[PDB]
């Protein structure tokens, strides 16, 4: 198998040096697209017809032409407590762009 796909990955702000501004969560689902894009490409990666292409191009010259990339397509919010300028917690609702909702080849 090993296509490109959505897997876990959890992120603690502290890691990234984030917990300066978000009070909490701590940590939270992030998710990874993992795994590579190479034929046969299944339906749920939704090839672009680059993403095609640009396979081909690489299988034919491996050392001058890149492979297509397994990545986010589809991203979801999440909803953080956060110091505002003022320093009181305040809720930002949907945070959009934290969270892999769909992964592709593209
Ligand atoms: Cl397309
Ligand atoms: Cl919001
Ligand atoms: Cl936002
Ligand atoms: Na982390
Ligand atoms: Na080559
Ligand atoms: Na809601």
Redesign the pocket.
Known sequence: GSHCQKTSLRVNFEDIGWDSWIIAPKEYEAYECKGGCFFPLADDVT????AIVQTLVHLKFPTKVGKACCVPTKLSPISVLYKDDMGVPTLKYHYEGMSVAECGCR
């Open positions: 090839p672009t017809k680059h």
